């Protein structure tokens, strides 16, 4: 292109060369610019104390000097110069600015994820960028692409009117599959939109995954766990119905209700071969169909 692209850091000095200009007077040169500040084409006079002299000043060599460039200085800068040969030279610049935010952080991260359901892993936050830029996630050292699974991201971009700088947020949500990696490792990174620059990365986090046992409506535990016992001695059967305050529990052997009153517990002491069989409990409720616990096989050896 004719226009040379200039990329400058916010808050830093910038010098724009007026090519083909004599180094000392006499100089036939003129700067014309159009920036966020002017909202129009303006001649930038070389004399001291001009309208813009706290922001942009022409140097003795004809170069344009900006002590501390800002977002509003983005725009077009043109110099038309004349050598001592009568040689006509033009310089055309397009100025864009940038700022690199501080290192991104993951806030409110989860120590433990629950397999089988959505979890908020954490929220990546980036403060003080221009232009906006973007946040992305890594998983086990590889890029994590959204909306596969189970995996989703809630993103937002916010501009601070007092500085023109951006705050970025990326909230990561995952649904870990049962049988998966019990310690997935995540990290987030910020990619500047300008200039070309290394990604800034958070320290990684490694939440553990807990796989909840499937919840039975009627729960049966047997001590000892096996339901296998030496001759003589005891087995105790215990029944629980979490969703009911006052459950009515009826014990069964081999699919047939035992001639007993309702009770949450059934102890089988002095076990002989005759006590061998499949046991379970049934929770009855008025207006509802009965529910059975898992079947436990009790044997002797």
């Amino acid at each position: 292109a004719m226009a040379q692209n200039i990329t400058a850091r916010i808050g830093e000095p910038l010098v724009l060369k007026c090519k083909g200009a004599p180094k000392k007077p006499p100089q036939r040169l003129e700067w014309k610019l159009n920036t966020g500040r002017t909202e129009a084409w303006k001649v930038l006079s070389p004399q001291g104390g001009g309208p813009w002299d706290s922001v942009a000043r022409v140097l003795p060599n004809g170069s344009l000097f900006l002590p501390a460039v800002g977002i509003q200085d983005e725009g077009i800068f043109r110099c038309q110069a004349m050598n001592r040969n009568g040689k006509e030279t033009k310089s055309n610049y397009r100025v864009r600015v940038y700022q690199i935010p501080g290192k991104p952080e993951i806030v409110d991260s989860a120590s433990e994820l629950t397999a089988g359901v959505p979890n908020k892993v954490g929220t990546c936050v980036s403060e003080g960028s221009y232009p906006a830029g973007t946040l992305s996630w890594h998983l086990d050292g590889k890029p994590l692409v959204p909306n596969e699974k189970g995996v989703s991201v809630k993103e937002q971009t916010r501009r601070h009117p007092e500085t023109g700088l951006f705050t970025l947020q990326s909230e990561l949500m995952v649904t870990p599959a049962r049988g998966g990696d019990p310690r997935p490792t995540f990290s987030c990174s910020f990619s500047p939109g300008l200039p070309r620059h290394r990604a800034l990365r958070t320290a990684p986090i490694q939440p553990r995954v807990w796989e909840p046992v499937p919840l039975e409506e009627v729960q049966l535990v047997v001590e000892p766990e096996g339901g296998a016992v030496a001759p003589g001695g005891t087995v105790t059967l215990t029944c629980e119905v979490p969703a009911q305050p006052s459950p009515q529990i009826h014990w069964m052997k081999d699919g047939v209700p035992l001639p007993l009153p309702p009770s949450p517990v059934l102890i089988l002491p002095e076990i002989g071969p005759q006590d061998q069989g499949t046991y379970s409990c049934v929770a009855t409720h008025s207006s509802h169909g009965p529910q059975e616990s898992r079947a436990v096989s009790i044997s002797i050896i």
Binding site: S111, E112, D181, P182, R208, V209, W210, E211, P212, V213
Partner: protein, 88 residues
Amino acid sequence: ACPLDQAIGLLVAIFHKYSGKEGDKHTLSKKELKELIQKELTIGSKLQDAEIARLMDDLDRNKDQEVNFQEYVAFLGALALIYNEALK
């Protein structure tokens, strides 16, 4: 497939198998912890009741009578090196 994924998956499951019995479902009471030690761990078969009580007290660093996952990880860490010497 990976024995690491497998063992770590196991340690998480074992913790919750006992932590979810009473009280806070994600911490181990003295009751739950003693049962975990005696039932799943090699180091606990030889130990007597007074020894286990001492062990459990030394596993509860903040003295809330509960052993949380962090206190439990530290436990396994020590065990790894204690089991390590015994295997030489």
